[PDB]
Amino acid sequence: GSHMNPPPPETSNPNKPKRQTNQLQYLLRVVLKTLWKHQFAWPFQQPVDAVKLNLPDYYKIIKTPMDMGTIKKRLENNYYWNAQECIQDFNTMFTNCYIYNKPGDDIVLMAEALEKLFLQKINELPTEE
């Protein structure tokens, strides 16, 4: 896309260790699946396109961008070593939204609905086997 948007987060790197765990499988098959199909998921399914949205300060503020499209790719391509890495990516995505936007902005209410679902699912993250 535009040279004025940063490259997306890494989703492929042969030097990084990687493993399948039952917790990472749950994050794909239960958590990502549930959030992806939510009515309010669409703004979070790809990196923020700050050019198209006319937000030229976005990547001045948000220096740790993350989105569910990136997480989806990371889970499908087995990028992660453990569930904590993936959970941190979801938390980063939510907190970016809350940092950049005004409380009560539509995008914040949408993020909050996804986060409430997220928390319910993560409270049932299975014991690592």
Ligand SMILES: OCc1cc(Br)ccn1
């Ligand atoms: O206003 C910032 C923003 C825009 C979109 Br689309 C998704 C997440 N955050």
